[PDB]
Tab-separated table of C-alpha atoms and ligand atoms in Angstrom:
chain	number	residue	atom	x	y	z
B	28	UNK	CA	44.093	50.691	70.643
B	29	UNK	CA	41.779	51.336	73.647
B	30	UNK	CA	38.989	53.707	74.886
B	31	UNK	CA	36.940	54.292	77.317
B	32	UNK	CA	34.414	56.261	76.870
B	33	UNK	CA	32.144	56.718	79.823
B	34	UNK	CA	28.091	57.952	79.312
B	35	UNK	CA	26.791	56.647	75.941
B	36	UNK	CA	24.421	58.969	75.488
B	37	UNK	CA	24.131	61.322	72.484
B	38	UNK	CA	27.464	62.877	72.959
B	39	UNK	CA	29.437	59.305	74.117
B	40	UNK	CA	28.169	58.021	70.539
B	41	UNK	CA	29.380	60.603	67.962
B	42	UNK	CA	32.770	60.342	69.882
B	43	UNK	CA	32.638	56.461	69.927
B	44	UNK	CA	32.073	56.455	66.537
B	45	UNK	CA	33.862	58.678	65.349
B	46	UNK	CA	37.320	57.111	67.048
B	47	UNK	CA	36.183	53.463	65.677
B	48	UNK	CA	36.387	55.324	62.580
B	49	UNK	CA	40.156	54.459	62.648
B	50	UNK	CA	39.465	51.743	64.663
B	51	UNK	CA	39.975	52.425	67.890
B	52	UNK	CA	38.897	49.712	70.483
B	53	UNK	CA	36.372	51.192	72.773
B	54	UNK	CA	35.009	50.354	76.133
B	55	UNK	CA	31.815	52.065	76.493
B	56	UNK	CA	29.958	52.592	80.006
B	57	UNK	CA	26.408	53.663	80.780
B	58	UNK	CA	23.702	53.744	83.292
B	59	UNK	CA	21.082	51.253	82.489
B	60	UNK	CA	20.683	48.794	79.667
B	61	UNK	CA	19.560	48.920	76.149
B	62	UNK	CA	20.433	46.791	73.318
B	63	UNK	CA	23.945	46.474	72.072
B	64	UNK	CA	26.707	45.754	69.209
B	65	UNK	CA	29.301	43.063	69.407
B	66	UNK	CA	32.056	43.791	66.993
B	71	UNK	CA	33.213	47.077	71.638
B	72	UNK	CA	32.967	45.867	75.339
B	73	UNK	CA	29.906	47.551	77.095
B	74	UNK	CA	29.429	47.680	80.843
B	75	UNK	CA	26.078	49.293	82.912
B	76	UNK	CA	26.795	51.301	85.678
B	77	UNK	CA	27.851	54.146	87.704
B	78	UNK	CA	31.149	54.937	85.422
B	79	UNK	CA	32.521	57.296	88.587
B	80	UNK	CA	32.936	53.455	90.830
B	81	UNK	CA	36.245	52.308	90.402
B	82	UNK	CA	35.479	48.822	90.130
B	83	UNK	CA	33.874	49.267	86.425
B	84	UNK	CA	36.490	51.592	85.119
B	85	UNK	CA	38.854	48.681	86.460
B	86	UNK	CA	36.475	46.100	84.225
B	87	UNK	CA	36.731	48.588	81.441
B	88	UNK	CA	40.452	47.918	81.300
B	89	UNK	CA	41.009	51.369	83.032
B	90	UNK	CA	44.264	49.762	84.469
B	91	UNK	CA	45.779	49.070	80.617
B	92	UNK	CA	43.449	51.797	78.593
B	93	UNK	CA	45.121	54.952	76.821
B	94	UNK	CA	42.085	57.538	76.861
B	95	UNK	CA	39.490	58.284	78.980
B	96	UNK	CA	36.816	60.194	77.639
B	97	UNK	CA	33.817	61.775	80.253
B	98	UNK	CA	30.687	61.858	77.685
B	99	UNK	CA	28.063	61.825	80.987
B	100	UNK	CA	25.421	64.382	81.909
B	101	UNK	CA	26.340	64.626	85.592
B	102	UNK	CA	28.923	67.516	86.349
B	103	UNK	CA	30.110	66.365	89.429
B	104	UNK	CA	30.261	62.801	88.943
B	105	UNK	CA	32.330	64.130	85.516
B	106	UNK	CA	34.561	65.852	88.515
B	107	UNK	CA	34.719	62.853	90.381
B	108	UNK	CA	35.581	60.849	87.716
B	109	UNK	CA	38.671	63.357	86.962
B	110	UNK	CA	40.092	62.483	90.484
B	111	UNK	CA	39.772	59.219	90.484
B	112	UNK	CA	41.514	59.092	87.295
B	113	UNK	CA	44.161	61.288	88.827
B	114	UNK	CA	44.522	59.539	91.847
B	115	UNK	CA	44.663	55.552	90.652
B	116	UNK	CA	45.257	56.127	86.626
B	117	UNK	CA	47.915	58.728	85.791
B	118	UNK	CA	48.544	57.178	82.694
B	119	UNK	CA	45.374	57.961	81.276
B	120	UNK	CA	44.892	60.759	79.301
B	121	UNK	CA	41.733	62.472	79.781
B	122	UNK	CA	39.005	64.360	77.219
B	123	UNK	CA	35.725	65.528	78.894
B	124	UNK	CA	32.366	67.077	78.283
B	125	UNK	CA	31.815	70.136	80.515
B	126	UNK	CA	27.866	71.642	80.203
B	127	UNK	CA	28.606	75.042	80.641
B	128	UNK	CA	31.264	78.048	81.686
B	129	UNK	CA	31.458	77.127	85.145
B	130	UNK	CA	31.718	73.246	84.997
B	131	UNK	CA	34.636	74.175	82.447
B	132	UNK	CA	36.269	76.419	84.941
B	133	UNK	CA	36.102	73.325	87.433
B	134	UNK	CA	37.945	70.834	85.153
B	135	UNK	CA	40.354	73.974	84.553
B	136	UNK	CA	41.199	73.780	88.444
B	137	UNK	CA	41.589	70.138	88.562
B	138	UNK	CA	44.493	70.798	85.544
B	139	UNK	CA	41.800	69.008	82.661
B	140	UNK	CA	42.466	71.047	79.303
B	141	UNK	CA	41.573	68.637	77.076
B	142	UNK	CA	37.377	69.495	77.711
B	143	UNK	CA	34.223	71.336	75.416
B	144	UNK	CA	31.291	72.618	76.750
B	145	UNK	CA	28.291	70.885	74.886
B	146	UNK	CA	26.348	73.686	73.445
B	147	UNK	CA	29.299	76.030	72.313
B	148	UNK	CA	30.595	74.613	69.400
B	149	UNK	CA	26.874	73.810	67.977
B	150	UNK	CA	25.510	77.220	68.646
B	151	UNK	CA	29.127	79.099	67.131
B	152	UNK	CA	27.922	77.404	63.873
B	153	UNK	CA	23.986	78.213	64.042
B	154	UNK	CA	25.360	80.970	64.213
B	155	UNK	CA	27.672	81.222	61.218
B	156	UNK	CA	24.474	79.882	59.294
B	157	UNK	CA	23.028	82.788	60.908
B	158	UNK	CA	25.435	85.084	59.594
B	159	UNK	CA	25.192	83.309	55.960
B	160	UNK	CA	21.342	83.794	55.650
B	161	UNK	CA	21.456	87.327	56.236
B	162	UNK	CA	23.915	87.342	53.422
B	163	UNK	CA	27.716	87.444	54.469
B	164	UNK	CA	29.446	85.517	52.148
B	165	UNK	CA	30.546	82.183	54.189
B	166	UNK	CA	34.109	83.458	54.489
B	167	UNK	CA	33.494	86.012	56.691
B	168	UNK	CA	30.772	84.207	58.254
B	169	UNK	CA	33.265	81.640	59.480
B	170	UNK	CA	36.063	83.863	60.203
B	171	UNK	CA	33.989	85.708	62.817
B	172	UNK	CA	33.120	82.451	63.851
B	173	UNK	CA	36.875	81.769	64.469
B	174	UNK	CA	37.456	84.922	66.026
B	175	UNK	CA	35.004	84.659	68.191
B	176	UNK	CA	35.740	81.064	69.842
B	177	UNK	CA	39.397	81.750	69.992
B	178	UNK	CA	38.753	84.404	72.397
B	179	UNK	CA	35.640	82.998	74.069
B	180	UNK	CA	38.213	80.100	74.969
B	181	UNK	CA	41.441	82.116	75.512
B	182	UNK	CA	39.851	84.538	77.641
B	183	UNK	CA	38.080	81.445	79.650
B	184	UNK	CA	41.419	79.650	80.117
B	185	UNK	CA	43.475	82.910	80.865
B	186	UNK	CA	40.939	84.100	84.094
B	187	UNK	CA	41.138	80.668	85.250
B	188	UNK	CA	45.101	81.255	85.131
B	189	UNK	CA	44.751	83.028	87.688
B	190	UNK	CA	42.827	80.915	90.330
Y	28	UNK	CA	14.430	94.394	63.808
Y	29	UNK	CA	17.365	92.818	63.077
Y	30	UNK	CA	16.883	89.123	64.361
Y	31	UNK	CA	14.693	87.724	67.151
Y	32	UNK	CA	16.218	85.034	69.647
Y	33	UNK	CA	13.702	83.071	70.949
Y	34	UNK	CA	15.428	81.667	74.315
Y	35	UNK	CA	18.471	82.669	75.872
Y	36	UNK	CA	20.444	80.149	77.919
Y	37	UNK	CA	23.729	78.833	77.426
Y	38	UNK	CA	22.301	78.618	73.175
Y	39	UNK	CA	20.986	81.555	72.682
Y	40	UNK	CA	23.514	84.033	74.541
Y	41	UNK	CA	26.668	82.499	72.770
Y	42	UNK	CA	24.238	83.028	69.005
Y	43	UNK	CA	23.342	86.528	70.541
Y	44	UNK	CA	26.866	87.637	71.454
Y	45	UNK	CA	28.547	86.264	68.334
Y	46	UNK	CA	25.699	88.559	66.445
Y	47	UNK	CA	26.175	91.420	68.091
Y	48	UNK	CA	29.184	91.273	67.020
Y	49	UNK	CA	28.835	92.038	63.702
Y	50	UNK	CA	25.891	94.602	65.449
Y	51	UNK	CA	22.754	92.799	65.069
Y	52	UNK	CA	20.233	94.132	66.448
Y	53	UNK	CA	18.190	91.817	68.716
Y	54	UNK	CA	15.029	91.401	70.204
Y	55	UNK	CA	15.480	88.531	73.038
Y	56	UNK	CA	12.542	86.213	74.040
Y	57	UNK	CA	12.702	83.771	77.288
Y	58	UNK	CA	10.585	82.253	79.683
Y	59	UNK	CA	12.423	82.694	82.427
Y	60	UNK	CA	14.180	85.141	84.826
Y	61	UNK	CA	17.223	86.792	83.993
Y	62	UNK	CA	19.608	89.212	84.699
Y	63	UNK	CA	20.573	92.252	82.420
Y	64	UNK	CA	22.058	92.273	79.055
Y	71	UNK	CA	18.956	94.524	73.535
Y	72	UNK	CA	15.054	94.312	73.230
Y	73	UNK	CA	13.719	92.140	76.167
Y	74	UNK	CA	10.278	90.230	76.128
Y	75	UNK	CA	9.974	87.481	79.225
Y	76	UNK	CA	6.863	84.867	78.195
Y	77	UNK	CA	6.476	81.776	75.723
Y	78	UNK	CA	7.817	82.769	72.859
Y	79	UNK	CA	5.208	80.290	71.229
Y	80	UNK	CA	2.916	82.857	71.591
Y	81	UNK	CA	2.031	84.951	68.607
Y	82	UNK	CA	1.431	88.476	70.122
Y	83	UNK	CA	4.936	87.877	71.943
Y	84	UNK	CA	6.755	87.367	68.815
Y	85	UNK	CA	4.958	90.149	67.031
Y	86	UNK	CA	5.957	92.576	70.024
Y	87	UNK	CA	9.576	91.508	69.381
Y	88	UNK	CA	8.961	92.619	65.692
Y	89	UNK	CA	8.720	89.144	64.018
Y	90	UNK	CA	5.658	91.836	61.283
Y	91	UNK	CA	9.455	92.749	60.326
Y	92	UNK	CA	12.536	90.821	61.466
Y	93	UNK	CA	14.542	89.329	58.858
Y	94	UNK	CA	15.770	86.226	60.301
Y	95	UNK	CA	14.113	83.895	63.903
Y	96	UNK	CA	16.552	81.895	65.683
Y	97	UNK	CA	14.887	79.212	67.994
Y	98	UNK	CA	17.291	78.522	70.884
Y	99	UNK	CA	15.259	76.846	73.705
Y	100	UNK	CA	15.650	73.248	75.034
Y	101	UNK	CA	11.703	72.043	74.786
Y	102	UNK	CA	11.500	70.714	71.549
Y	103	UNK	CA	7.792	70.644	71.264
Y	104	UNK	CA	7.351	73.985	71.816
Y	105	UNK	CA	10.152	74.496	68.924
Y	106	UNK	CA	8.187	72.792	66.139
Y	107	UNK	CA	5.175	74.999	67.261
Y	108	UNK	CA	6.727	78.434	66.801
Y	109	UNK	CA	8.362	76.679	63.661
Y	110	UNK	CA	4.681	76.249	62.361
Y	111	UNK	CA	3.612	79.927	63.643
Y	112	UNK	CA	6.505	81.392	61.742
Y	113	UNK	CA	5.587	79.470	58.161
Y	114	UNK	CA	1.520	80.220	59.464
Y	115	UNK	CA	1.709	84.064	59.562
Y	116	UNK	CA	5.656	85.047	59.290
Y	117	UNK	CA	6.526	83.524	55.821
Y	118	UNK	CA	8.940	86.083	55.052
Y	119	UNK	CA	11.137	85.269	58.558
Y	120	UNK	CA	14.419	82.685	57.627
Y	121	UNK	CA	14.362	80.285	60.767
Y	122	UNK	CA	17.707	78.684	62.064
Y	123	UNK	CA	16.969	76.495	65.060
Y	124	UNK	CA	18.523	74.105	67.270
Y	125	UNK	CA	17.541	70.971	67.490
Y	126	UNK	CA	18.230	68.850	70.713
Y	127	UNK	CA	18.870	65.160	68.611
Y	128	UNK	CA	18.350	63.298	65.916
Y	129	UNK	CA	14.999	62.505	66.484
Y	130	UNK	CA	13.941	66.392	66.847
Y	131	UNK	CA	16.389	66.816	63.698
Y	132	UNK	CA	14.068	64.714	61.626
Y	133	UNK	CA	10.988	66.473	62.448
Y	134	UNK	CA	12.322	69.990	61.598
Y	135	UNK	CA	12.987	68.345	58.173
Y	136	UNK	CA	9.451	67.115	57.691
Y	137	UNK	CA	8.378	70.772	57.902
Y	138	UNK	CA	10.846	71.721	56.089
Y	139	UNK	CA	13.703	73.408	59.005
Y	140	UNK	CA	16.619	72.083	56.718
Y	141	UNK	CA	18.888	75.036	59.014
Y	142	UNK	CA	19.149	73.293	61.969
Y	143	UNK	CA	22.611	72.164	64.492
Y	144	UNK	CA	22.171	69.235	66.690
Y	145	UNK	CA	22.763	70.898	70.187
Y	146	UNK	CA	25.797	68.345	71.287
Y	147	UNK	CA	27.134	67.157	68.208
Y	148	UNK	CA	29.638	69.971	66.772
Y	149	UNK	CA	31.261	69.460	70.071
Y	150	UNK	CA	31.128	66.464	70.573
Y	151	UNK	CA	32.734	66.132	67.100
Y	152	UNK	CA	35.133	68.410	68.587
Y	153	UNK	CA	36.149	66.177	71.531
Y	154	UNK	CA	36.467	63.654	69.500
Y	155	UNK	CA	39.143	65.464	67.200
Y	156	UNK	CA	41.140	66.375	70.619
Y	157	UNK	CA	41.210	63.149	71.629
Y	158	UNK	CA	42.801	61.627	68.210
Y	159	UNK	CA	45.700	64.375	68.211
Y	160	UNK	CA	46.025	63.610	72.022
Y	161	UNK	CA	46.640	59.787	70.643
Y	162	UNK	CA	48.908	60.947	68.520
Y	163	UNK	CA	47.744	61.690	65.471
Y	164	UNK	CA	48.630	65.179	63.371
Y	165	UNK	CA	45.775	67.800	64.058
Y	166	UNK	CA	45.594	68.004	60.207
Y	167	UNK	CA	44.595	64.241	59.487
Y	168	UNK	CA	42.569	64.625	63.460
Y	169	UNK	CA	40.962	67.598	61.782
Y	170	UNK	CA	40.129	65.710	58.311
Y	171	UNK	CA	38.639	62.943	60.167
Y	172	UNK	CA	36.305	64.955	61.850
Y	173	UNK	CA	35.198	67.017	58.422
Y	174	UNK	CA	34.771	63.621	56.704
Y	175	UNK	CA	32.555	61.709	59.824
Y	176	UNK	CA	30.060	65.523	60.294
Y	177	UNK	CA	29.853	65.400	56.179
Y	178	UNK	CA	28.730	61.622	56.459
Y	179	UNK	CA	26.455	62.087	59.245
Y	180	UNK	CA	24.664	65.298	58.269
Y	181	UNK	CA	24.220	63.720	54.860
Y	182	UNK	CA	22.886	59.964	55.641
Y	183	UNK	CA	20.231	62.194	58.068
Y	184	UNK	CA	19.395	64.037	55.313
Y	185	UNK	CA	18.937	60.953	53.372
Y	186	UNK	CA	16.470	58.871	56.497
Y	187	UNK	CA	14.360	62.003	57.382
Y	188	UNK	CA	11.771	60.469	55.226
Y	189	UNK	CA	11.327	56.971	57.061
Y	190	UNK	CA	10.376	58.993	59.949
Y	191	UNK	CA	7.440	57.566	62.316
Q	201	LIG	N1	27.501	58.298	86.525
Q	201	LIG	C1	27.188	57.826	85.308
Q	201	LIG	N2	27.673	56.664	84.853
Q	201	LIG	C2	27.350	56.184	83.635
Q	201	LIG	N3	26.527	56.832	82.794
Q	201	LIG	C3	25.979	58.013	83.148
Q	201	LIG	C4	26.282	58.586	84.456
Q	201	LIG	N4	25.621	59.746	84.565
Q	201	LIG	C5	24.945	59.901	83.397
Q	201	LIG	N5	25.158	58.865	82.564
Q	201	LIG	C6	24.613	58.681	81.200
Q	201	LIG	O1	25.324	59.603	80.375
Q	201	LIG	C7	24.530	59.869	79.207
Q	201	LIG	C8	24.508	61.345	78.845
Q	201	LIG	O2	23.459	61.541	77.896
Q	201	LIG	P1	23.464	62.590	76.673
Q	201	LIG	O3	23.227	63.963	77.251
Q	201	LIG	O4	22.311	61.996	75.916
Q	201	LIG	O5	24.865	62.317	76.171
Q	201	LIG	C9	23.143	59.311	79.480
Q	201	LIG	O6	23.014	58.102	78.732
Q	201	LIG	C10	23.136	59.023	80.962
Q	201	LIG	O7	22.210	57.977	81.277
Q	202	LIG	N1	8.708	78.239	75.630
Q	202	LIG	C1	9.755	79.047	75.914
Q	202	LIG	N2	9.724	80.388	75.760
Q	202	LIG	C2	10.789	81.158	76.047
Q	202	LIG	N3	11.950	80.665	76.521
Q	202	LIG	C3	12.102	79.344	76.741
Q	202	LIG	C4	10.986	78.445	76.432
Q	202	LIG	N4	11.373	77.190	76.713
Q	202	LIG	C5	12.647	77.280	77.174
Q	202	LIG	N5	13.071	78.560	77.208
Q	202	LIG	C6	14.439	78.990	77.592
Q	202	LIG	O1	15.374	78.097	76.945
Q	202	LIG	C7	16.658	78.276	77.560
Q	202	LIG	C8	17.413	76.960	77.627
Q	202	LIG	O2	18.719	77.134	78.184
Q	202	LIG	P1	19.969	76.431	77.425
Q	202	LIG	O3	19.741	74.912	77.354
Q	202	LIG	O4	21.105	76.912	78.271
Q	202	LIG	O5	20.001	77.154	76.084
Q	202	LIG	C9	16.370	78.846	78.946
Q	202	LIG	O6	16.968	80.139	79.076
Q	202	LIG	C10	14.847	78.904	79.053
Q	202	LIG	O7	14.411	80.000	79.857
């Protein structure tokens, strides 16, 4: 089935290829050229103008996934999506607390900051080296996302 | 003592906090101004006498958390140079950077986007419609993969 996945960048290609994995379609967009695979549809531009998402089969796609650097464009992607795609569901990127808070308001669940989920396990290698056996090490890492995210969710609850 | 976190953005706070946890001690280095927090040093933490004034004569463990990647490899090199004894996790900002920690010989190194990224990835299969148990084993089998074949390349490096 279909994808788009807007921003190629380093995070837009784990997630691309991870979801052709099991063969997911995908429609990738990205500010300026490089050089490119057939076997994927792949479109340069400004992913937040209507008109490309609309060439990237935004009209008939299933997922939408915001994979771009930009915070706000990432917002005014969201909208647009909103406002002329309903049908799309929606994962996103958000760079930090704040930008997550912001997709939050605008009703987007379905988001990670960047950096959490990378430094939560440097961490748990941290926690390893100095000798905690890798059980533990991971269960505080569990315990301590769970919350991180809970507690960010349940203060944005309350708008 | 304890454990010395060189940089403290969005990287090094989330390493920091999930330390203290456990209650870690922590000598924090950054460049830059910030607000209060353990042990506090502002400057380039590629500077020697910095990291010896956070105790890195006797930490046990150096976490490098900052975004310039140069500078990384260069405290990476002071710590082997004079710290031998200091365990180094560090985060490395891509693949490119990735492979250069592994020529000196960083094998303890997370790619900055790619856990989450991974992540997103896993929420958007179970938001397709697939169980979070076969979205979760998906993900586990593509980091694995990944991680691995890096391993592997490293040494084509130019
Ligand atoms: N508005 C946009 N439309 C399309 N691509 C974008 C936009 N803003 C940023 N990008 C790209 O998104 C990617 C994010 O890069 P990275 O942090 O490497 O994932 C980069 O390739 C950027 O050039
Ligand atoms: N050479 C350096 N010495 C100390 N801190 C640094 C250096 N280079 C970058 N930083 C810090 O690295 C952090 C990067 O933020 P983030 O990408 O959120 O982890 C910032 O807090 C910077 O102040």
């Amino acid at each position: 089935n279909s994808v788009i996945i807007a921003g190629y960048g380093r995070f837009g290609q784990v997630v691309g290829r991870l979801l052709s994995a099991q063969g997911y379609h995908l429609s990738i967009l990205d500010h300026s050229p490089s050089q490119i695979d057939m076997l994927n549809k792949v479109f340069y531009g400004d992913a937040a103008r209507k008109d490309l998402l609309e060439a990237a089969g935004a009209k008939d796609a299933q997922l939408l996934v915001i994979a771009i650097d930009a915070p706000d464009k990432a917002l005014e992607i969201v909208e647009l999506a909103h406002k002329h795609y309903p049908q799309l569901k929606i994962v996103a990127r958000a760079i930090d607390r704040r930008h997550a808070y912001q997709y939050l308001r605008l009703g987007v669940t379905s988001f990670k900051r960047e950096t959490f989920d990378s430094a939560v396990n440097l961490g748990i290698e941290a926690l390893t080296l100095l000798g905690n056996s890798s059980t533990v090490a991971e269960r505080a890492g569990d315990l301590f996302s769970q919350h991180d995210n809970a507690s960010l969710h349940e203060l944005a609850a309350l708008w």
